[PDB]
């Protein structure tokens, strides 16, 4: 009921990994499930930070995490490496950036400013 | 148990008298060995949920959280597991024996430390593949965002949450050290099993209608043509008692299997991840869970988030 | 050792695993007997060879104690008519010791000689003599009318009750007398009953046994004063009391006993027994087999290569050092075919790695793999009727 | 259920002849009271949420 | 009652709770017996004190009813030889109605 008709979010209930789908199969005196699951591989390590100081404001990600390959900071989804320039359309802001423990200084873009020129 | 020895007790006459009852002895032996082998399956399904024996780093900078009272000590075993092992106050004489478990308490206390070291260091990930390190405050922010509260509410309040977690760990250690009847759900099982074995061993002082309750006595002062009937009475009584014991043990082992299944599911879905099931792991919104070994079970410590000091507003 | 598997499983090929084939117990030897010191014949002649035996109203009783009683010198004779023992085997009374002996004697009819028994009704069974819902020693009735053929008289009473009054009890006296004359229904028989007691006090009367020497700290079989047992005898830190003859903890098994000849208290314990279990790598692979004695210190037994583990003693398997995955479970942290032998190691839980944890580093995947995993679940059983 | 009254029925000799059967009746009484307490715990766990 | 608890639990100390110590029943008094009013003895002598006992070809049979019987006056004597009652106890026959 919960793995064939839908998609279970219960850990290790219908496979080893993240549940995508399931196919049932009959049997002599039972049932055989074949769970199709998604498993990440070929990980890489980056430098991270909880927020970002920008002109006295603290920028937190909207969906994802701040990563750095040594030089420059991008935003990714926490389950895959697909980096993107840090802008204002994907990082909300709350409070002055003196409280968060471990803020790094960096730049945050604003796609409206260049369109003004 | 050994049926031919519990019933007779090294009396060839009684052995011959009993051999004519079919294979009841082999059947009871089979049932008992079945449940004895199922117990190890229960244990390995609850605890062996991990693939590698993770380890904790020597530098402890977990954003201000104090995991010293749950992480193991190089003496064995953690401090809370030792308090648990102390909170419980638990033979082989005649046809009875107690097999040892397959996993020593050392290995179980090592499993419940691998799981803990993997939960503090990687979060959800090690239960779905390889362990992907993450600073603890960011993992806690992921969890907060999971329960519906934005992540900045943690980074603004990291110190207060660390202090509350430390004070709650202290509260649990005290409530364990002081209060009696802590692990009643395990003392109950131990007492039931021991009382059943006690009744079994005490059922050997009954006559069931015979002249005496000891077999070598009737063997001594009577003739085989008459000794047949007295030995038969004792034999049928002891057989009925052994069968009763085996059936009640079967029922109790089925119940214990259901409870170990519940515990395995709770480990898989509350320790390896974050449960969105209401009141499944704690009262409130689930953040994380830490397992702990026990004498004959497991003890979960669920860390949950509960709102307080609410206000009233007008809405639209 | 292997063939017991092929027999316990009723097959010629058994798969891998660890089976329970049988038990083992170190059989005892040199059985001993321990009877009291006083060894003098008992005077049964001053009992059975009398002539003045009272009537059915005042049937006599005498006590016997403080001797050794040869019973096989009376039971095996043609001198008695009915020699019927209730609860005891007549050929065995030369091994059982009693606390006292009660010999009751009287003279009754040869027809009414059947009514001296528990569970029979009649005249004397209901008015003169009775036995309870239990056993007496034996009944011994011999025809003695040759030396008897009036002076013998007889009348709701209980077993072992005496009626001494002879009064008229509607004026009718109830008593009556026999007739002594060689003229079948009234031919008199001289009858006695022997009554014993078992395991209620120190015993003093029993037959000609040897009272052999004593042993200690060995699994021996003893015939200790009618109490027969098997086990190892040891010395006790405990002490009994002047009024204690033996002891026990639970379930009627004697756990300690004082001596009848030396007043010394010894402890009795069951001698080393246990189960045996055969770890086999499967007959299709090979035919060698390891064996383990459960809860046994193998100081008591083949012993080619011995390893003493928390589960028992293991023979036939070599204790290897480096942990591997678990092949065959043994118990208590041991698991067990590699390199032409059988090995017994300490199983390990898996690869031991430590994730590099830092407060400013993260690990993010770059590729992925989709997988399919099977899972089998039974839903029905056969509908037997 | 009560053993000594269900199977004997207030007969002293029956009680005497029954005392020789060990403690089967105490064990059955124990089992029954166990399931009674469990039936109470069931409602206590379902409704007192 | 506390002694009955300490006895039922095989212990000199007992924790809290509610135990079942025993049953209870109001014992009856002044037993009664109710037999019919018709009390006129019947002649078992006209059965036993006879000589025309037919042979084993036509072994005679007679019926007895409508009386208060008297069984002791027969059983208690030494007149007979074999007195074996199948299913009944002779000393009880003075309490059984047929």
mmCIF file of C-alpha atoms in Angstrom, chain B residues 2 4-5 10 29 33 40 44 50-57 59 61-63 92-97 99-104 107 110-111 117-118 120-122 131-138 142 198 201-202 204-206 211 213-214 216-224, chain C residues 8 10 18 20 22-23 25 27-28 86-90 92 95-96 135 198-199 226 228-230 249-253 270 273-275 294-295 310-312 326 328-335 346-365:
data_model
loop_
_atom_site.group_PDB
_atom_site.id
_atom_site.type_symbol
_atom_site.label_atom_id
_atom_site.label_comp_id
_atom_site.label_asym_id
_atom_site.label_seq_id
_atom_site.Cartn_x
_atom_site.Cartn_y
_atom_site.Cartn_z
ATOM 1 C CA UNK B 2 16.565 -32.319 27.556
ATOM 2 C CA UNK B 4 14.693 -37.720 28.379
ATOM 3 C CA UNK B 5 16.710 -36.347 31.313
ATOM 4 C CA UNK B 10 19.224 -41.428 34.038
ATOM 5 C CA UNK B 29 13.467 -29.964 21.597
ATOM 6 C CA UNK B 33 15.789 -24.658 19.591
ATOM 7 C CA UNK B 40 19.726 -14.040 17.650
ATOM 8 C CA UNK B 44 20.929 -8.822 14.680
ATOM 9 C CA UNK B 50 25.070 -0.352 10.023
ATOM 10 C CA UNK B 51 27.523 -1.463 7.345
ATOM 11 C CA UNK B 52 30.815 -0.089 8.703
ATOM 12 C CA UNK B 53 31.963 0.524 12.281
ATOM 13 C CA UNK B 54 32.275 4.293 12.172
ATOM 14 C CA UNK B 55 34.452 6.122 14.685
ATOM 15 C CA UNK B 56 34.387 9.501 16.402
ATOM 16 C CA UNK B 57 37.091 12.124 15.794
ATOM 17 C CA UNK B 59 38.631 16.785 18.376
ATOM 18 C CA UNK B 61 33.833 20.668 18.350
ATOM 19 C CA UNK B 62 30.199 19.737 17.726
ATOM 20 C CA UNK B 63 28.888 23.308 17.743
ATOM 21 C CA UNK B 92 22.210 -25.843 34.902
ATOM 22 C CA UNK B 93 21.276 -28.618 37.337
ATOM 23 C CA UNK B 94 18.999 -31.275 35.805
ATOM 24 C CA UNK B 95 18.356 -31.396 32.072
ATOM 25 C CA UNK B 96 18.399 -27.587 31.883
ATOM 26 C CA UNK B 97 20.961 -25.229 30.373
ATOM 27 C CA UNK B 99 22.943 -20.958 26.071
ATOM 28 C CA UNK B 100 24.975 -17.761 25.696
ATOM 29 C CA UNK B 101 23.999 -15.103 23.153
ATOM 30 C CA UNK B 102 25.877 -14.897 19.879
ATOM 31 C CA UNK B 103 26.728 -11.201 20.317
ATOM 32 C CA UNK B 104 28.516 -10.388 23.559
ATOM 33 C CA UNK B 107 29.846 -6.141 20.463
ATOM 34 C CA UNK B 110 30.258 -1.327 19.947
ATOM 35 C CA UNK B 111 27.341 -1.348 17.500
ATOM 36 C CA UNK B 117 29.303 8.179 15.828
ATOM 37 C CA UNK B 118 27.687 7.960 12.402
ATOM 38 C CA UNK B 120 26.607 12.778 15.048
ATOM 39 C CA UNK B 121 29.056 13.043 12.132
ATOM 40 C CA UNK B 122 26.979 12.499 8.966
ATOM 41 C CA UNK B 131 28.899 8.886 5.147
ATOM 42 C CA UNK B 132 29.131 12.514 3.991
ATOM 43 C CA UNK B 133 30.626 14.623 6.778
ATOM 44 C CA UNK B 134 28.810 17.787 7.830
ATOM 45 C CA UNK B 135 29.360 20.240 10.711
ATOM 46 C CA UNK B 136 26.886 19.525 13.464
ATOM 47 C CA UNK B 137 25.241 22.960 13.540
ATOM 48 C CA UNK B 138 24.430 22.680 9.835
ATOM 49 C CA UNK B 142 18.715 20.868 8.241
ATOM 50 C CA UNK B 198 11.090 -22.068 38.451
ATOM 51 C CA UNK B 201 11.788 -27.208 38.135
ATOM 52 C CA UNK B 202 9.292 -27.285 41.013
ATOM 53 C CA UNK B 204 9.299 -32.450 39.886
ATOM 54 C CA UNK B 205 8.004 -32.824 43.469
ATOM 55 C CA UNK B 206 4.539 -33.996 42.382
ATOM 56 C CA UNK B 211 3.094 -43.577 45.277
ATOM 57 C CA UNK B 213 7.592 -38.206 43.567
ATOM 58 C CA UNK B 214 11.090 -39.689 43.114
ATOM 59 C CA UNK B 216 14.621 -44.256 41.905
ATOM 60 C CA UNK B 217 12.574 -44.885 45.062
ATOM 61 C CA UNK B 218 9.725 -46.670 43.264
ATOM 62 C CA UNK B 219 12.461 -48.304 41.188
ATOM 63 C CA UNK B 220 14.064 -49.535 44.417
ATOM 64 C CA UNK B 221 11.144 -51.016 46.361
ATOM 65 C CA UNK B 222 8.909 -52.413 43.611
ATOM 66 C CA UNK B 223 8.757 -55.009 40.789
ATOM 67 C CA UNK B 224 8.770 -54.083 37.082
ATOM 68 C CA UNK C 8 19.512 -37.286 13.948
ATOM 69 C CA UNK C 10 17.449 -38.914 8.887
ATOM 70 C CA UNK C 18 25.537 -26.469 13.976
ATOM 71 C CA UNK C 20 22.458 -30.797 18.523
ATOM 72 C CA UNK C 22 22.921 -35.854 21.799
ATOM 73 C CA UNK C 23 24.036 -35.289 25.373
ATOM 74 C CA UNK C 25 27.413 -37.665 30.939
ATOM 75 C CA UNK C 27 29.169 -42.516 33.662
ATOM 76 C CA UNK C 28 29.944 -43.385 37.301
ATOM 77 C CA UNK C 86 1.885 -54.367 49.551
ATOM 78 C CA UNK C 87 4.068 -51.706 47.954
ATOM 79 C CA UNK C 88 7.367 -53.529 48.534
ATOM 80 C CA UNK C 89 9.009 -56.285 46.510
ATOM 81 C CA UNK C 90 9.598 -59.307 48.785
ATOM 82 C CA UNK C 92 14.235 -56.667 47.717
ATOM 83 C CA UNK C 95 18.349 -53.453 50.512
ATOM 84 C CA UNK C 96 15.801 -51.130 52.178
ATOM 85 C CA UNK C 135 0.468 -49.813 52.365
ATOM 86 C CA UNK C 198 10.188 -44.964 54.871
ATOM 87 C CA UNK C 199 12.324 -41.801 54.987
ATOM 88 C CA UNK C 226 18.001 -47.036 50.969
ATOM 89 C CA UNK C 228 20.157 -44.402 45.937
ATOM 90 C CA UNK C 229 21.789 -41.671 43.896
ATOM 91 C CA UNK C 230 24.566 -40.700 41.517
ATOM 92 C CA UNK C 249 17.267 -27.031 48.057
ATOM 93 C CA UNK C 250 14.407 -27.624 45.593
ATOM 94 C CA UNK C 251 12.624 -30.409 43.688
ATOM 95 C CA UNK C 252 13.015 -33.391 46.019
ATOM 96 C CA UNK C 253 16.616 -34.111 44.988
ATOM 97 C CA UNK C 270 25.359 -33.695 39.778
ATOM 98 C CA UNK C 273 26.827 -33.560 32.034
ATOM 99 C CA UNK C 274 25.853 -31.457 29.067
ATOM 100 C CA UNK C 275 24.983 -31.363 25.422
ATOM 101 C CA UNK C 294 28.372 -27.281 26.018
ATOM 102 C CA UNK C 295 29.108 -25.682 29.414
ATOM 103 C CA UNK C 310 32.723 -19.067 26.931
ATOM 104 C CA UNK C 311 30.299 -21.502 25.250
ATOM 105 C CA UNK C 312 32.120 -24.667 26.336
ATOM 106 C CA UNK C 326 30.828 -15.052 10.524
ATOM 107 C CA UNK C 328 28.819 -20.740 11.459
ATOM 108 C CA UNK C 329 27.624 -19.326 14.803
ATOM 109 C CA UNK C 330 28.915 -20.906 18.003
ATOM 110 C CA UNK C 331 28.014 -18.302 20.618
ATOM 111 C CA UNK C 332 29.529 -15.778 23.028
ATOM 112 C CA UNK C 333 31.468 -13.950 20.333
ATOM 113 C CA UNK C 334 32.863 -17.004 18.529
ATOM 114 C CA UNK C 335 31.931 -18.003 14.992
ATOM 115 C CA UNK C 346 36.155 -13.977 16.989
ATOM 116 C CA UNK C 347 33.832 -12.507 14.372
ATOM 117 C CA UNK C 348 34.114 -8.823 13.501
ATOM 118 C CA UNK C 349 31.312 -6.398 12.769
ATOM 119 C CA UNK C 350 32.678 -4.792 9.603
ATOM 120 C CA UNK C 351 35.205 -2.392 8.163
ATOM 121 C CA UNK C 352 36.345 0.181 10.726
ATOM 122 C CA UNK C 353 36.589 3.626 9.134
ATOM 123 C CA UNK C 354 36.415 7.127 10.601
ATOM 124 C CA UNK C 355 34.876 9.970 8.614
ATOM 125 C CA UNK C 356 37.104 13.060 8.459
ATOM 126 C CA UNK C 357 35.034 15.518 10.494
ATOM 127 C CA UNK C 358 35.738 19.254 10.491
ATOM 128 C CA UNK C 359 33.637 22.244 11.515
ATOM 129 C CA UNK C 360 34.037 23.906 8.101
ATOM 130 C CA UNK C 361 34.044 21.036 5.573
ATOM 131 C CA UNK C 362 31.206 19.247 3.796
ATOM 132 C CA UNK C 363 30.928 16.358 1.352
ATOM 133 C CA UNK C 364 28.499 16.477 -1.562
ATOM 134 C CA UNK C 365 27.914 13.778 -4.199
#
